[PDB]
Amino acid sequence: HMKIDILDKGFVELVDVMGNDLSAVRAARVSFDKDEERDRHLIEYLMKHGHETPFEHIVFTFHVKAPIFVARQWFRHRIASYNELSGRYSKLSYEFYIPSPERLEGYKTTIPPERVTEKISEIVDKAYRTYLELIESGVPRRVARIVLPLNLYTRFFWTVNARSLMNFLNLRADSHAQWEIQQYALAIARIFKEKCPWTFEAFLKYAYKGDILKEV
Amino acid sequence: HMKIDILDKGFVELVDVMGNDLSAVRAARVSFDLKDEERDRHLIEYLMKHGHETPFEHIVFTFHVKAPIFVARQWFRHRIASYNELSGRYSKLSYEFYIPSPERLEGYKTTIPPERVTEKISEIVDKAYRTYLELIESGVPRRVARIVLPLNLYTRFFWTVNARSLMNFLNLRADSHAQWEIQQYALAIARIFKEKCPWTFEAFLKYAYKGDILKEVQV
Amino acid sequence: HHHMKIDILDKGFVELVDVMGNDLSAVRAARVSFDMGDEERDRHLIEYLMKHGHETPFEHIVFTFHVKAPIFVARQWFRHRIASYNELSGRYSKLSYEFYIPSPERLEGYKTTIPPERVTEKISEIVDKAYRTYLELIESGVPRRVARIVLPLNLYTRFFWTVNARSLMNFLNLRADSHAQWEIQQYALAIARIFKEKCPWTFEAFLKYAYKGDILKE
Amino acid sequence: HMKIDILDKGFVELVDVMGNDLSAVRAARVSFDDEERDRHLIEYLMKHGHETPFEHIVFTFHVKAPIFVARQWFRHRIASYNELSGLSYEFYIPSPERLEGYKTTIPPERVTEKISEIVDKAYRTYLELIESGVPRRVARIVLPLNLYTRFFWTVNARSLMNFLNLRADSHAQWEIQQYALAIARIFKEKCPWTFEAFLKYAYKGDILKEVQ
Ligand SMILES: Cc1cc2nc3c(=O)[nH]c(=O)nc-3n(C[C@H](O)[C@H](O)[C@H](O)COP(=O)(O)OP(=O)(O)OC[C@H]3O[C@@H](n4cnc5c(N)ncnc54)[C@H](O)[C@@H]3O)c2cc1C
Ligand SMILES: Cc1cc2nc3c(=O)[nH]c(=O)nc-3n(C[C@H](O)[C@H](O)[C@H](O)COP(=O)(O)OP(=O)(O)OC[C@H]3O[C@@H](n4cnc5c(N)ncnc54)[C@H](O)[C@@H]3O)c2cc1C
Ligand SMILES: Cc1cc2nc3c(=O)[nH]c(=O)nc-3n(C[C@H](O)[C@H](O)[C@H](O)COP(=O)(O)OP(=O)(O)OC[C@H]3O[C@@H](n4cnc5c(N)ncnc54)[C@H](O)[C@@H]3O)c2cc1C
């Protein structure tokens, strides 16, 4: 019931979550068996001192639709669990990330922004037409797809604990990461903030090393 | 809800769980939806049969475990998991020790009665603890004084572990090669696992589990 | 001195950069000792560890590889999380643009409605068009990080991969198999070849007791 | 093998090392191919948080340490461990000077003696139980936490630096601090440039900045 559209056809969707701020408090105290302000104080204490292991007992599963070039950076985060859509279990669709002209406003190019978009669209169509021609002629899908561009969309499930999510955000929710992964990072951050507000607030306050979460 | 007493003062308690069997099915398909039970059960078996283990990483457990240090050290060898042990600058410590029952000790041919061995362990534990307390009342900080305490001191921890890594744990620990004490804990972890993810556990036993005991000892 | 290089596909390769240890590193680890090789007894322990799934000692043998592979290969490769990766960026060295074009013979096998040579040619033409589009966008002032999204998945990349023998055996179980894509198998055959050269007892034990694929036995 | 003695019977010893500072440089450039240029890149990587190249430097240590120390140590998950299975029996007895600092009600030499006495009683009880036919992995449970153990530890430089951030610090117990200083000494000998860069840019502990 929480879904954020990203880019032209992408999204981040929350699938499941185990626990909440109090799950890191329980883990830190090692107690299954109310005081809101002392609980927050502890969450703040854990964050400013680098006792990050309690945040490992807060887990999220997201469903992400993202271009391959985004997914390749994302998948470098080893301390998480990934499953990528494979034709073997469910149907594949072929969709592509076409940047908006606004996205290239910033840079001062020889060719109008809209012409850049159009050239990217053109390649997508030619590459996808060639892929289909190869399929129809008997080249297996696994071989034919190597002509498709890096802006082809993929989907995956990503299960990650809050600790690893904070590291993800430190590296990706930053103005040095490419813009496409920043947008996904912002969405990940919003969901995390909704489910674990005290942890998120303590994170921004003490640990967060980036910039874009302190603006937008 | 779920708590199982283990040994003389130990337990395994379920704190939380994310997902169920269908969490693995949804991860393998990569969709968050048109349920079909026979279809979804076949898929679980399929995955386990052909070693496609990764979808099982999207089921996650947190357990609260009370166990002796010698058990905890064997346990903490499982690195693909999250641990938090009671310290406690955060909460209060108490001092209880595991004393094997005479029944635990019969089967061994010893030169003295099993109960005598119980008595001797109890006595040395009592002396060690008394010395500890003695050192504390003298001004010796706890972190120093505690090094005289024996390996059968109970500790507590939270353990967050996904179902794949939990299956690896059970392969190693729910098995007659493991020490009897950690076997007991692994049987309790297996019962909770089965209760929460019955189809995966059944598929695990049928296709993947390399230990002996779970296919003999119910639950 | 450790150095080996095996050429893979048209332009790819797998190059051995360094190795820590040898078969006896696993024996030393298992015994917590400095034994140096009693050969009967050390080999028997290697088989023993391998047979019974006691693989932790094999973690103390470590390889660093330099791999040049198409992006579609590197993506499946990088799914192996218990390992260390560093991929070529332009911040520290020269970026090159080369692409994997399969051969006719690779495309025989399948009963295609056009000759395999024409399939190869069609792939070359669309790759060429994408690349020229990439270069035209760069010349127009488009940042490389944006322009590059039109490049296809057969673009070669390079990376360093550091990985322990245990995780490498798991890599070979999954990738050295007649179900993996052919290009994947080729790379897994080169990794295997080096592993065998450097840890022959571990490798032979792996084949006998633990190896789950089919192509390494061939 | 570089071997440093720690505590009364402990040690850290280097078993093997893969690479050196240049391994991180090669990893960063992704190339199997000028000393100050290379030192500059090391500092750059560390300064800008590009730590992954330091994962391609690997060490194997042989450590003899008390169990209370080994438990803290084994908490570091991004490493490979093999512990001695089956054995010898030695115990760490804190020196008097270790126990000076706090006002105690008895002299620190007495406290040391009290530790030693209870250690001997416990070990004596362990030996009687084995003598009686009690299996060793049951009998051993009466032995105290200051029993020494031995393990091999294979760890990369990046994870080594996280371990030093946490253990080579005034907040860790004095004993693991001693082992961390020794691990640091060896790391610095084998990777002087990575280690200097680490202190100057990434290291969040205190003691390594003033304990040479
Ligand atoms: C300024 C900068 C420039 C970069 N340039 C490049 C480049 O050119 N090429 C390139 O490939 N990458 C580069 N990177 C790294 C790139 O960002 C990776 O995609 C990403 O950093 C992987 O992040 P991680 O290892 O922190 O996360 P994860 O893989 O999730 O690991 C999480 C944390 O666990 C620890 N960890 C996990 N596994 C290990 C392990 N095996 N050994 C030691 N510690 C471990 C680390 O401490 C890490 O902080 C660069 C990073 C930065 C910050
Ligand atoms: C002064 C001090 C006081 C302490 N007090 C306590 C206490 O009260 N209770 C207690 O249990 N422990 C305590 N510890 C131990 C501490 O909590 C850590 O378990 C230990 O220091 C290992 O740290 P690590 O998790 O960074 O190292 P590793 O386990 O090697 O991990 C290294 C890096 O990998 C990443 N990583 C690895 N695995 C995961 C994962 N599963 N999820 C997310 N990220 C991961 C992290 O980013 C981390 O930086 C204490 C330690 C110190 C030094
Ligand atoms: C009967 C028995 C006897 C034992 N005897 C000894 C002994 O004498 N000495 C001793 O030290 N220990 C001993 N152990 C502990 C044992 O060696 C393992 O450390 C423990 O069982 C954890 O198993 P694991 O590494 O598979 O689990 P985890 O550590 O959770 O790992 C799960 C899986 O993830 C992967 N993985 C995680 N980290 C790495 C890594 N760095 N490299 C490669 N793969 C990785 C592996 O594929 C592994 O199977 C014993 C255990 C048992 C059950």
Which residues does residue B160 pair with via DSSP β-bridges, in sequence order? Answer: B62, B82
Q: Looking at the CA of C52, name the nearest ligand.
A: 3
Please give the single-letter amino acid code of residue B170. Answer: L
Burial D154-190 (b: 16+ CB within 10 A, else e): bbbbbbbbbbbbbbbbeebeebbbbbbbbbbbbbbeb
Is D155 a pocket residue for ligand 1 (Cβ < 6 Å)?
A: no
Q: Determine the distance separating the centroid of ligand 2 and the alpha carbon of D199, expressed in angstroms.
A: 20
Contact between C191 and C172 under an 8 Å Cβ cutoff? The reply is yes
Report helix, strand or coil for C181: coil
The answer to whether the peptide bond before residue C21 is cis (omega within 30 degrees of 0) is no
C-alpha span between D34 and D55 (Å, rounded) = 23
Report helix, strand or coil for A90: coil
HSE-up (13 A, CA, CB side) for residue A179: 13
Report helix, strand or coil for C195: helix
Contact between B141 and D105 under an 8 Å Cβ cutoff? The reply is no
- Cβ-defined contact of A18 to B64 (cutoff 8 Å): no
- Cβ-defined contact of C100 to A146 (cutoff 8 Å): yes
| Surface-to-core class of residue A121, CB atoms within 10 Å of its CB (0-12 exposed, 13-18 middle, 19+ buried) | middle
Contact between C114 and C98 under an 8 Å Cβ cutoff? The reply is no
D125 is in an annotated binding site: no
**Helices then strands, each counted (H, E), chain B:** 9, 5
Q: Specify the pairing of strand D148-156 against strand B60-68.
A: unpaired
Experimental technique for the deposited model:
X-ray
- The DSSP string of A95-160 is -B----HHHHTTS--SS-HHHHHHHHHHHHHHHHHHHHHHHHTT--HHHHGGGSBTTBEEEEEEEE
Tokens 């034994």 locate to: C35
| Shortest-distance atom of ligand 2 to CA D78 | 30
Q: Is A150 part of the contact surface with chain C (CB cutoff 8 Å)? A: yes
Question: Given ligand 3 and candidates B162, B170, B172, B182, which is best to mutate, with the most ligand atoms within 8 Å of its CB?
Answer: B172
Contact between B24 and B200 under an 8 Å Cβ cutoff? The reply is yes
Q: Is A194 left (phi over 0), alpha (psi -120 to 50) or beta?
A: alpha
DSSP state of A49: T
The DSSP element (H or E) to which C184 belongs, if any, is helix C182-198
Contact between B151 and D67 under an 8 Å Cβ cutoff? The reply is yes
Q: What are phi and psi of B109, to 5 degrees?
A: -85, 100
Chain D residue numbers with beta carbons less than 8 Å from the beta carbon of C94 are none
Contact between C63 and C198 under an 8 Å Cβ cutoff? The reply is yes
Q: Is B157 part of the contact surface with chain A (CB cutoff 8 Å)? A: yes
Name the maximum alpha-carbon separation found in chain D: 68
C216 is in an annotated binding site: no
Assigned token pair, C59? 């973690």
C-alpha span between C172 and C195 (Å, rounded) = 10
Contact between D38 and D45 under an 8 Å Cβ cutoff? The reply is no
Report helix, strand or coil for B108: strand
Cα dihedral: B130, B136, B141, B144 (round 10) = -10
C-alpha span between C35 and B107 (Å, rounded) = 37
Chain D residue numbers with beta carbons less than 8 Å from the beta carbon of B159 are none
What does each C-alpha distance from A145 to A97, B186, C152, C209, D97 come to in angstroms?
16, 46, 9, 36, 70
Closest Cβ–Cβ partner in B79, B108, B134 for D77:
B79
Assigned token pair, A119? 């050239």
Chain B residue numbers with beta carbons less than 8 Å from the beta carbon of A161 are 82, 160
Q: Looking at the CA of D156, name the nearest ligand.
A: 1
Chain D residue numbers with beta carbons less than 8 Å from the beta carbon of B112 are 132
Domains located in chain A, CATH noted: 1-216 (3.30.1360.170)
Tokens 């120390």 locate to: D69
C30 is in an annotated binding site: no
Rg of chain C, C-alpha, whole Å: 21
The DSSP element (H or E) to which C201 belongs, if any, is helix C200-205
Burial A12-34 (b: 16+ CB within 10 A, else e): bbbbbbbbebebbbbbbbbbeee
Question: Given ligand 1 and candidates D50, D201, D204, which is best to mutate, with the most ligand atoms within 8 Å of its CB?
Answer: D50
Chain D residue numbers with beta carbons less than 8 Å from the beta carbon of B121 are 125, 129, 141-142
Please give the single-letter amino acid code of residue A124. Answer: V
Closest Cβ–Cβ partner in B68, B123, B143 for D173:
B143
Cα angle D45, D46, D48; round to 5: 65
Resolution to one decimal, Å: 2.0
Q: Specify the pairing of strand A59-67 against strand A153-161.
A: antiparallel
* CA C31 to the chain's CA centroid: 31
Q: Determine the distance separating the centroid of ligand 1 and the alpha carbon of C82, expressed in angstroms.
A: 13
| Shortest-distance atom of ligand 1 to CA A78 | 29
Question: Given ligand 2 and candidates D55, D76, D155, which is best to mutate, with the most ligand atoms within 8 Å of its CB?
Answer: D76
| Shortest-distance atom of ligand 3 to CA C54 | 17
Q: Is D20 left (phi over 0), alpha (psi -120 to 50) or beta?
A: beta
- Give chain D as a 3 state SS string: CCEEEECCCEEEEEEEEECCHHHHHHHHHCCCCCHHHHHHHHHHHHHCCCCHHHHHCEEEEEEEEEHHHHHHHHCCCCCEEEECCCCCCCECCCCHHHHCCCCCCCCHHHHHHHHHHHHHHHHHHHHHHHHHCCCHHHHHHHCECCEEEEEEEEEEHHHHHHHHHHHCCCCCCHHHHHHHHHHHHHHHHHCHHHHHHHHHHCCCCCHHHCCC
Tokens 């936490």 locate to: D145
C-alpha span between A149 and A124 (Å, rounded) = 7
Contact between B43 and B22 under an 8 Å Cβ cutoff? The reply is no
C-alpha span between A47 and A68 (Å, rounded) = 33
| Surface-to-core class of residue A178, CB atoms within 10 Å of its CB (0-12 exposed, 13-18 middle, 19+ buried) | middle
Q: Nearest residue of D to residue B114 by CA position?
A: D134
Assigned token pair, B144? 């120093």
- Cβ-defined contact of B144 to D94 (cutoff 8 Å): yes
Query: Is C175 part of the annotated catalytic residue set?
Result: yes
Report helix, strand or coil for A186: helix
Q: Is D41 part of the contact surface with chain C (CB cutoff 8 Å)? A: yes
Tokens 């990369």 locate to: D156
Other C-beta atoms lying within 10 Å of the C-beta of residue C2: 14
With contact defined as 3+ CB pairs under 8 Å, the chains touching D are B, C
Angle formed by the axes of helices D192-201 and D174-190, to 10°?
130
- Cβ-defined contact of C34 to D17 (cutoff 8 Å): no
Q: Looking at the CA of C166, name the nearest ligand.
A: 3
Please give the single-letter amino acid code of residue B46. Answer: Y
A190 is in an annotated binding site: no
Of C101, C107, C105, C106, the residue nearest C131 (C-alpha): C101
Which residues does residue C68 pair with via DSSP β-bridges, in sequence order? Answer: C13, C158
Count A/C contacts: CB-CB distance under 8 Å: 118
Q: Is D134 part of the contact surface with chain C (CB cutoff 8 Å)? A: no
Closest Cβ–Cβ partner in A42, A61, A85 for B58:
A61
- Residue partners of D143: CB distance under 8 A and separation at least 6: B150, B151, D89, D122, D123, D126
D150 is in an annotated binding site: no
Residues composing chain B: 219
